[PDB]
């Protein structure tokens, strides 16, 4: 029935945070949030950014998996191209038998040509998608455990056969149950070649908000896809990342929002970006208003799911009338690491006041 | 000052343990170790080995990094040929940093086969898998040192960028705590051992699993020597040596513990056929002046293992340290005592705060 809230953790940490810090910051995010009946806990990887500082998504996820009971964890993403298949499908299983299954597996590869460099990648020829197809095919295999041996364009991979008592046959790193975790990709352009491939795949798709025809545009190649290849599309597996901040009245709200850590991002770091890039024509065209005057103020009064739990509430609901909705609301995490306290009353005013009254139609 | 208390966890987990349990273990492990004052905890790396069954030693170095606060850590070893060397290298200085250096680096070829074919390599023991270690290590320290460079290598692609042409823009640093190279180790095993002679050359920490004296004084000489040539001052107290080693009030229950207790039955079961296979105990043989047809059990407690109350103990180290000239740390193999811990605790807790104080290094 209802829609679930997620976390999203870029994340987004003012420059000058300690690798210590940001590491803290995510463990009490996530006992947080599964405190209070958050879904899922998505978790980046960057190897060269400075806001989105977590070159190791994997690390944080083991470090909250005994500490929490009910949330699931997803890497969004590991970067296929950056790590051999093998070492990386491994870690992805035994990561999953950690977490007895609350564990997810988001792929993709990689948008910052800096971290591709680093990997051996220039010119971002060797080309990233393959990377990802040739990545993905070794990883399914491995999870299987049955010997084979590939000679890739990229890596070298195999399964051994047992040689010739328990304690000597070879170890089972599978994921849980035996079999490859969900799979999810994020898609980001209007015309997503990643909810393309994920509805053939019958992936978990996640799309970033950019406004009203985008988000149409994710779920409408999405669900062709999913058709065409024989799958049914369910809705309720869209998960979708908003700026979202909830207190007792909308006045509060929007001065939190205004004068706190996100407003202090979007304005020092996102904005100029976005502009630079004209990443907020979606929203000017939604709004009426010519993306030059796209501000801070503009993003909070009509974009950001931002007000009291009735204001948040009305807001997503007239998203789903517009677009038939999805089936998580990922919240995305801002830096609170020194000001926990309105930042956590917002997130369980989401999960407990908010997200249980939306109810998708699909 | 004091030899320095270790535990090095392989680890060494019944048949049928879960991911999960051997997770818990092994955190409880660092938190209770931390608690007495052993100084460092090591974990091993294994992708096809069902007792010793951590592929990802730094998810547990990371899960108990923020719940200790002097115990260092250290992957023994993290395996070279299996990963790339710069998603390798990011890792490595972002976890340092987390631990605020409380860290070293272990690094190895490794020696099954099986894990080796898993990632590519095909007749380990065509690739050559120390030509790989060797290109890796090159990589990584190159990372480290964030210089610009590309490096089109035999076995890895592999670079650092420039800077693009505001603090917020420039490239995230992943480097080891201070700035620096981690501190790295090396195991040997083998009487002439090349490791031994590697880890001399480059001033690298000599960690050597007791096998008798011969072995143990011929890794030392191996060592110092190649130290000495290459322009090094060989220090003995970094010298690290893996023990069997239990502790109780009295001599008869510290054997009868080991006898009937996690130890006796791993090497049982697993160990002692594998060891008397591959002639393993001719050293232990040779040095107690029995046939090593006749070591079993009984003969590795009485005149092997560092078992005993602490005077017993005590003395057999000083007996060692004599024969030998003695090492920097103790290095305590960690069993699976996950059921029922306290007599293990026990035993840790007087190894390090009785035994260990009062032996000192010349
Ligand atoms: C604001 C923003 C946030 C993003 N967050 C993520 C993320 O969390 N995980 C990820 O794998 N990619 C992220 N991306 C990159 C896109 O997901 C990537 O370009 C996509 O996988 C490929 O898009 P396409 O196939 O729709 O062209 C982000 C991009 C932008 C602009
Ligand atoms: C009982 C036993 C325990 C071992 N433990 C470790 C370990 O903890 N870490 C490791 O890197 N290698 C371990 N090894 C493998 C040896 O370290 C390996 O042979 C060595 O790295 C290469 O030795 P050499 O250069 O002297 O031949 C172990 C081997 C045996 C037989």
New binding site residues.
């Given amino acids: 029935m209802a829609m679930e809230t997620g976390l ?1 953790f ?1 994340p987004y940490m003012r420059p000058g945070r300690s690798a210590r810090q940001t590491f803290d910051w995510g463990i009490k995010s996530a006992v947080q949030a599964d405190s209070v009946g958050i879904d899922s806990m ?1 978790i ?1 990887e960057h190897a060269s950014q400075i806001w989105e500082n977590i070159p190791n998504p994997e690390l944080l996820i083991a470090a909250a998996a005994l500490q929490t009971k009910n949330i699931k964890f997803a890497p ?2 590991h970067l296929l191209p950056h790590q051999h298949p093998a070492k990386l499908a491994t870690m992805i299983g035994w990561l999953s038998q950690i977490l007895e299954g609350r564990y997810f597996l ?1 792929i ?2 990689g ?1 910052y040509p800096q971290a591709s460099y680093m990997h051996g990648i220039r010119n971002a020829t060797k080309n990233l998608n393959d990377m990802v197809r040739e990545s993905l095919f070794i990883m399914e295999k491995i999870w299987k455990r049955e010997p084979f041996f590939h000679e890739g364009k990229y890596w070298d991979a195999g399964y051994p056969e047992e040689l010739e008592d328990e304690q000597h046959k070879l170890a089972d790193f599978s994921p849980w149950g035996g079999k490859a975790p969900e799979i999810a ?5 209007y015309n ?4 393309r491939l994920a509805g053939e795949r019958n992936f978990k798709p996640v799309s ?1 908000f950019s406004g009203l025809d985008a988000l149409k545009r994710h779920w409408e190649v999405y669900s062709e896809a999913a058709i065409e290849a024989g799958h049914t599309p369910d809705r309720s597996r869209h998960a979708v990342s908003h700026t979202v901040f909830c207190a007792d009245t909308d006045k509060e709200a929007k001065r939190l929002v205004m004068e706190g850590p996100i407003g202090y991002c979007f304005e020092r770091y996102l904005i100029p970006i976005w502009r630079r890039f004209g ?1 907020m024509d979606g929203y000017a065209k939604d709004a009426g208003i010519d993306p030059v005057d796209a501000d801070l103020e503009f993003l909070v009064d009509n974009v950001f799911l931002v007000g009291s739990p009735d204001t948040v509430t009305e807001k997503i609901n007239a998203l789903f009338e517009a677009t038939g909705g999805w089936g998580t609301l990922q919240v995305e995490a801002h830096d609170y690491y020194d000001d926990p306290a309105p930042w956590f009353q917002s997130l369980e005013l989401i999960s407990k006041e908010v997200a249980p009254k939306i109810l998708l139609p699909k």
Avoid: E, L, N, Y
Avoid at 185 to 189: A, D, E, K, Q
Avoid at 192 to 195: G, I, Y
């Fill in positions: 999203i870029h998505m980046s969004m993403a988001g993709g590869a948008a990709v994020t898609g980001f352009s997503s070649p990643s909810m970033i990443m």
